[PDB]
Design a protein around this ligand. Structure first.
Ligand SMILES: COCCCC[C@@](O)(c1ccccc1-c1ccccc1)[C@@H]1CCCN(C(=O)[C@H]2C[C@@H](N)[C@@H](O)C2)C1
Ligand SMILES: *[C@@H]1O[C@H](CO)[C@@H](O[C@@H]2O[C@H](CO)[C@@H](O)[C@H](O)[C@H]2NC(C)=O)[C@H](O)[C@H]1NC(C)=O
Length: 337
């Protein structure tokens, strides 16, 4: 086909990127994270008890207001590093961009306050493989591919730095392509280790000149769902020591004045060095030697089979425009802009 649709994304604080979808006839809109590290679709359900405050504070899908709704009702449970969500399956039509797909999704009836009380978004749309879908539900992208409408069986992500401007575009995703308004040059493509996970090999991780980490190779997941770059607790501890970074209950910090002179961090992928300066990795609120500044890196030990792995989140994606290629099982990187 020729279709290459686009969805605009909202950037909240540089930690949440999300966009709109519509479910049903007439369409009920939701804000969703597009997550390459998961494969399922869910939104909150009108059936969610208001005993869950998250279901109070977020938008709820009402099956009964939709003509295209088809009952299934099979129980679903989804696990994330943080929250666990529960519900049942429903089928309805979902619009992304200009594309309309009949999809199977979870309607969530149990949403914990941690973490969804902290979400600026309603639900998630997983962009991962069926291999990782809970319940073996066909994921939304596969269904689109089935539709046979995209130009190329790929999708791409642009993530932006948060701006004060109203005009400024927080993010964009493209279905079936990439937008070259947002990258310079040509893509460098790295093959997936295997189909079913958006994960690739990483040669090393460098703090400065010296090759400190993942020195004998490691794994890299390219995760649009993730805010920060993540590594193993061991990998991260050492990298953090290398920066003189300090550990706090939620985050890693440096004195706000010392951030600019921190060493670059390079990720070696596909034979090329992908480099983030401290300007990419410190949230520099002030430059006071008196204040402490957050780094956008943290530890997350992701268990097997996917882990241990690094996850390359928005901190990375902000620098590098990312093309996810379903046909060729490759991920492409280009310089964002
Ligand atoms: C760029 O947009 C980021 C959106 C926010 C992601 C997130 O920051 C978040 C913040 C506040 C409330 C909820 C959630 C959140 C929680 C669960 C699922 C989706 C979003 C997540 C915090 C927990 C760890 N981290 C992930 O493991 C990630 C791993 C990834 N695969 C996802 O499934 C979750 C990201
Ligand atoms: C909801 O989806 C489930 C899971 O895909 C359906 O269960 C399957 O239905 C087919 C076709 O009738 C059976 O042959 C399979 O063996 C079933 N799978 C399992 C795991 O039980 C279910 O039928 C659908 N429900 C409704 C109400 O439409």
């Amino acid at each position: 086909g020729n279709t290459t649709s686009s969805v605009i994304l909202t950037n909240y604080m540089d930690t949440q990127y999300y966009g709109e979808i519509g479910i049903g006839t007439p369409p009920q809109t939701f804000k969703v994270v597009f997550d390459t590290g998961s494969s399922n679709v869910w939104v909150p359900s009108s059936k969610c008890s208001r005993l869950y405050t998250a279901c109070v504070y977020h938008k709820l899908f009402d099956a009964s207001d939709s003509s295209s709704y088809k009952h299934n009702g099979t129980e679903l449970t989804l696990r994330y590093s943080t929250g666990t969500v529960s519900g049942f399956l429903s089928q309805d039509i979902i619009t992304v961009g200009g594309i309309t797909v009949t999809q199977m999704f979870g309607e969530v009836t149990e949403m914990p306050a941690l973490p969804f009380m902290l979400a600026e978004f309603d639900g998630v749309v997983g962009m991962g493989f069926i291999e990782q879908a809970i319940g073996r539900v066909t994921p939304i992208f596969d269904n689109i591919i089935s539709q046979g409408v995209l130009k190329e069986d790929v999708f791409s992500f642009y993530y932006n730095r948060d701006s004060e401007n109203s005009q400024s575009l927080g993010g964009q995703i493209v279905l079936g392509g990439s937008d070259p308004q947002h990258y310079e040059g040509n893509f460098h493509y790295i093959n997936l280790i295997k189909t079913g996970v958006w994960q690739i090999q990483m040669k090393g991780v460098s703090v400065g000149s010296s090759t400190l980490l993942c020195e004998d190779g490691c794994l890299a997941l390219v995760d649009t769902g993730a805010s920060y770059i993540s590594g193993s607790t061991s990998s991260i501890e050492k990298l953090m020591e290398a920066l003189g970074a300090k550990k706090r209950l939620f985050d890693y910090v440096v004195k706000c004045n010392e951030g600019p002179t921190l060493p670059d961090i390079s990720f070696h992928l596909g034979g090329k060095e992908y480099t983030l300066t401290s300007a990419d990795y410190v949230f520099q609120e002030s430059y006071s030697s008196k204040k402490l500044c957050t780094l956008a890196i943290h530890a997350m030990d992701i268990p097997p089979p996917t882990g241990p792995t690094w996850a390359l989140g928005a901190t990375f994606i902000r620098k590098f425009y990312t093309e996810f290629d379903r046909r060729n099982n490759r991920i492409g990187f280009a310089l964002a802009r």
